[PDB]
Design an enzyme around this catalytic site. Structure first.
Site, PDB file in Angstrom:
ATOM      1  N   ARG A  55       0.875  -1.145   0.000  1.00 12.86           N
ATOM      2  CA  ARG A  55       0.000   0.000   0.000  1.00 12.86           C
ATOM      3  C   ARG A  55       0.926   1.211   0.000  1.00 12.86           C
ATOM      4  O   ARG A  55       1.777   1.378   0.887  1.00 12.86           O
ATOM      5  CB  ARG A  55      -0.901  -0.082   1.267  1.00 12.86           C
ATOM      6  CG  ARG A  55      -2.049   0.923   1.358  1.00 12.86           C
ATOM      7  CD  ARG A  55      -2.816   0.805   2.693  1.00 12.86           C
ATOM      8  NE  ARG A  55      -3.763   1.904   2.929  1.00 12.86           N
ATOM      9  CZ  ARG A  55      -3.600   2.814   3.895  1.00 12.86           C
ATOM     10  NH1 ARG A  55      -2.559   2.806   4.713  1.00 12.86           N
ATOM     11  NH2 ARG A  55      -4.536   3.722   4.123  1.00 12.86           N
ATOM     12  N   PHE A  60       1.724  10.596   1.389  1.00 11.78           N
ATOM     13  CA  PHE A  60       1.423  10.146   2.734  1.00 11.78           C
ATOM     14  C   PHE A  60       2.500   9.184   3.227  1.00 11.78           C
ATOM     15  O   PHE A  60       3.291   9.603   4.070  1.00 11.78           O
ATOM     16  CB  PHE A  60       0.030   9.506   2.694  1.00 11.78           C
ATOM     17  CG  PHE A  60      -0.448   8.891   4.011  1.00 11.78           C
ATOM     18  CD1 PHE A  60       0.002   9.380   5.249  1.00 11.78           C
ATOM     19  CD2 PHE A  60      -1.318   7.793   3.956  1.00 11.78           C
ATOM     20  CE1 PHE A  60      -0.411   8.761   6.439  1.00 11.78           C
ATOM     21  CE2 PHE A  60      -1.714   7.193   5.149  1.00 11.78           C
ATOM     22  CZ  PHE A  60      -1.262   7.672   6.380  1.00 11.78           C
ATOM     23  N   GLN A  63       3.711   1.517   2.851  1.00 12.38           N
ATOM     24  CA  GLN A  63       3.503   0.547   3.916  1.00 12.38           C
ATOM     25  C   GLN A  63       3.933  -0.853   3.498  1.00 12.38           C
ATOM     26  O   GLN A  63       3.595  -1.298   2.397  1.00 12.38           O
ATOM     27  CB  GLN A  63       2.024   0.500   4.281  1.00 12.38           C
ATOM     28  CG  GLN A  63       1.679  -0.387   5.503  1.00 12.38           C
ATOM     29  CD  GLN A  63       0.179  -0.473   5.760  1.00 12.38           C
ATOM     30  OE1 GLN A  63      -0.606   0.279   5.181  1.00 12.38           O
ATOM     31  NE2 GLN A  63      -0.318  -1.388   6.578  1.00 12.38           N
ATOM     32  N   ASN A 102      -0.615  -0.739  12.685  1.00 10.54           N
ATOM     33  CA  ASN A 102      -1.238  -1.593  13.705  1.00 10.54           C
ATOM     34  C   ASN A 102      -2.715  -1.721  13.468  1.00 10.54           C
ATOM     35  O   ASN A 102      -3.190  -1.263  12.420  1.00 10.54           O
ATOM     36  CB  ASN A 102      -1.044  -1.067  15.130  1.00 10.54           C
ATOM     37  CG  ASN A 102      -1.513   0.347  15.435  1.00 10.54           C
ATOM     38  OD1 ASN A 102      -0.747   1.125  16.006  1.00 10.54           O
ATOM     39  ND2 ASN A 102      -2.700   0.815  15.071  1.00 10.54           N
ATOM     40  N   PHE A 113       5.386   1.598   8.233  1.00 11.17           N
ATOM     41  CA  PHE A 113       5.258   2.496   7.092  1.00 11.17           C
ATOM     42  C   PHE A 113       6.380   3.538   7.205  1.00 11.17           C
ATOM     43  O   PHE A 113       6.947   3.826   8.289  1.00 11.17           O
ATOM     44  CB  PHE A 113       3.886   3.182   7.066  1.00 11.17           C
ATOM     45  CG  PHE A 113       3.531   3.953   8.329  1.00 11.17           C
ATOM     46  CD1 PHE A 113       3.139   3.260   9.497  1.00 11.17           C
ATOM     47  CD2 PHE A 113       3.550   5.357   8.309  1.00 11.17           C
ATOM     48  CE1 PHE A 113       2.759   3.977  10.640  1.00 11.17           C
ATOM     49  CE2 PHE A 113       3.168   6.058   9.456  1.00 11.17           C
ATOM     50  CZ  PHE A 113       2.773   5.371  10.613  1.00 11.17           C
ATOM     51  N   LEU A 122      -1.166  10.868  13.477  1.00 12.02           N
ATOM     52  CA  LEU A 122      -0.893   9.501  13.889  1.00 12.02           C
ATOM     53  C   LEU A 122      -0.115   9.539  15.166  1.00 12.02           C
ATOM     54  O   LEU A 122       0.120   8.472  15.723  1.00 12.02           O
ATOM     55  CB  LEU A 122      -0.125   8.758  12.767  1.00 12.02           C
ATOM     56  CG  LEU A 122      -0.859   8.653  11.430  1.00 12.02           C
ATOM     57  CD1 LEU A 122       0.016   7.968  10.415  1.00 12.02           C
ATOM     58  CD2 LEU A 122      -2.163   7.890  11.616  1.00 12.02           C
ATOM     59  N   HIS A 126       0.738   5.519  16.783  1.00 17.80           N
ATOM     60  CA  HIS A 126       1.650   4.646  16.052  1.00 17.80           C
ATOM     61  C   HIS A 126       3.034   4.988  16.568  1.00 17.80           C
ATOM     62  O   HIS A 126       3.384   6.177  16.649  1.00 17.80           O
ATOM     63  CB  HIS A 126       1.576   4.913  14.554  1.00 17.80           C
ATOM     64  CG  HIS A 126       0.301   4.393  13.912  1.00 17.80           C
ATOM     65  ND1 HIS A 126       0.109   3.238  13.279  1.00 17.80           N
ATOM     66  CD2 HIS A 126      -0.916   5.050  13.955  1.00 17.80           C
ATOM     67  CE1 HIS A 126      -1.154   3.167  12.960  1.00 17.80           C
ATOM     68  NE2 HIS A 126      -1.764   4.259  13.369  1.00 17.80           N
TER      69      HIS A 126
END
Lengths: 165, 11
Positions: A55, A60, A63, A102, A113, A122, A126
């Site tokens: 992904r 952004f 991942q 997660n 990521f 985040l 994370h």
């Protein structure tokens, strides 16, 4: 002590792209750093070599880490399937931050990521445990194969990985 | 939205 440095050689449909190396903040998140280091050398018998970035969303993050199912639903830590959120001392301050993906509090496995932008939303959720030390241009070249929805136009794999220092 | 989850990817 010296924080470990790990590398990944990325390939795009089997063609080598380049090397990205990462400094892991073992001095601040020892258990999370140790998990990523051991999964990069493959020393427990399983790890990141041969797995893909499933992904990638341009602007952004990229991942990866699902070495069992290769789709975001698998992977596991070196401690068992999942482990706790060690701490949230570090934040997602800009491009290059290495952080754990997660599925809620205390569900860390192997997925991670690499941020290509500041993602302050985040923080607190994370665990940040490393940063890109060299090869940020290889991460940028990787984003060109993602999309808004995250699916990649090419298969982007970790052709090799291991520890440098 | 813009999250990074493992299993149910949310908006």
């Amino acid at each position: 002590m010296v924080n470990p440095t790990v590398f990944f050689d990325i390939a795009v449909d089997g063609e080598p792209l380049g090397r990205v190396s990462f400094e892991l903040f073992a001095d601040k998140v020892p258990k999370t750093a140790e998990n990523f280091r051991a999964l990069s050398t493959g020393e427990k018998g399983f790890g990141y070599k041969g797995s893909c970035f499933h992904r990638i969303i341009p602007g952004f993050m990229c991942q990866g880490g699902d070495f069992t199912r290769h789709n975001g639903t698998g992977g596991k830590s070196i401690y068992g399937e999942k482990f706790e959120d060690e701490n949230f001392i570090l934040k997602h301050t800009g491009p290059g931050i290495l952080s754990m993906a997660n599925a809620g509090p205390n569900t860390n496995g192997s997925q991670f990521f690499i941020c290509t932008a500041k993602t302050e939303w985040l923080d607190g959720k994370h665990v940040v445990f490393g940063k890109v030390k060299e090869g940020m241009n290889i991460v940028e070249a990787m984003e060109r194969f993602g999309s808004r929805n995250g699916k990649t136009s090419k298969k982007i794999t970790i052709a090799d990985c291991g520890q440098l220092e | 939205x813009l999250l990074v989850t493992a299993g149910l990817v949310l908006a």
